[PDB]
Design a protein around this ligand. Structure first.
Ligand SMILES: [Cl-]
Ligand SMILES: [Zn+2]
Length: 358
């Protein structure tokens, strides 16, 4: 890699690892469209297995960017419209509070207070219907954003219904395979477990446990190389030969809602570039990121703005991930760690690197 990239990465990430006690980490810096890879530490501490460019990490909510793009691909196929009512795809949701709640609301966390988590007691299809049938909104739809797995998670499950495919099969055939993400998994196969890093929570090795709508909301595992390719695909949609996927990527970076200086995409979140770094750092703190905030609609949605900071944080019990990129500059970063450490530290490190290379 160029000397300037090696220097800033060492001076930014090695101290981050020192400060946050991260056992293993993989970083890709995309510079002038090309990825440069860095690894530190261990995928499995007790086995002394190093992090490599083939190590799988839990992406947590970075999974939502895949869900948003898969939804965008469905829009471009004419299979769904974001204005469609939820009940078009789930007629059994007869409770009156669902009148007026569209796929747009589900995708962008604006249905009116759907909760952050689907409750752990939901283990069956009927449990899930009961949950949504009895949920009472705190706000009218399209007025408040409340980040929620139960919102975008349901969006993903319904967006694939017209195709007749399962969510996992739709994602594999329509997103992973065309983009040659051949080491990206909703369910890690037995032959790849050897590359599945352990996450570490309070010194204990952990993996994410099954939950309702997990594949849609937080269930993808991937390598640093496949995640660099995901960033390249989102930086350069016109290089994707499948038109519906090219358009799906673009639609996921459309701006549908604004609150403060932040815009909500489909999975992705965006700000205008140049960005105020303190706003992305401070806004990544869960005290803000998980809070209810009024939104203003953008009608029609703004088509993907190349001068944007586009990003997403993700966490599981044992992992912490961050992706950010700037289409106008062909500049991006992927940070995958097997400890869940605070989002503001992730964003600050990412901005120090990309700011140095702009
Ligand atoms: Cl140094
Ligand atoms: Zn040093």
């Amino acid at each position: 890699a160029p000397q300037q990239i090696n220097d800033i990465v060492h001076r930014t990430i090695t101290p981050l690892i020192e400060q946050q006690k991260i056992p293993g980490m993989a970083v890709a810096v995309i510079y002038q469209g090309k990825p440069y890879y860095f690894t530190w530490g261990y995928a499995d501490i007790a086995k002394k297995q190093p992090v490599t460019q083939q190590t799988l990490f839990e992406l947590g909510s970075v999974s939502k960017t895949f869900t948003g793009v898969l939804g965008g691909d469905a829009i471009a196929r004419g299979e769904i419209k974001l204005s469609d009512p939820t009940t078009k795809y789930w007629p059994e949701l007869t409770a009156k509070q669902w009148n007026g709640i569209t796929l747009l609301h589900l995708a962008t966390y604006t249905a009116g207070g759907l909760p952050l988590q689907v409750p752990d007691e939901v283990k069956s299809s009927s449990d899930l219907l009961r949950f949504y049938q009895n949920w009472q909104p705190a706000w009218a739809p399209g007025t408040q954003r409340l980040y929620a797995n139960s919102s975008i998670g349901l969006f993903g499950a319904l967006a694939v219904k017209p195709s007749g495919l399962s969510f996992e099969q739709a994602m594999q055939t329509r997103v992973f395979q065309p983009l040659k993400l051949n080491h990206t998994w909703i369910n890690v196969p037995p032959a790849e477990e050897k590359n599945y890093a352990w996450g570490y929570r309070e010194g204990k090795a952990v993996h994410v446990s099954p939950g309702a709508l997990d594949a849609e909301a937080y269930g993808v595992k991937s390598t640093i190389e496949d995640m660099a390719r995901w960033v390249q695909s989102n930086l350069k949609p016109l290089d994707i030969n499948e038109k519906t996927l090219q358009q799906g990527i673009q639609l996921a970076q459309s701006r549908y809602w604004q609150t403060g200086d932040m815009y909500q995409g489909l999975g992705w979140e965006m700000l205008d570039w140049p960005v105020n770094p303190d706003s992305i750092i401070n806004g990544s703190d869960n005290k803000i990121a998980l809070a209810a905030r009024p939104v203003k609609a953008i009608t029609p949605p703004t088509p993907a703005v190349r001068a944007s900071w586009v990003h997403k944080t993700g966490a599981t019990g044992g992992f912490g991930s961050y992706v950010a990129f700037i289409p106008e500059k062909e500049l991006g970063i992927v940070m995958l760690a097997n400890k869940n450490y605070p989002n503001p530290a992730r964003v600050d490190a990412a901005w120090q690197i990309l700011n140095a290379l702009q």
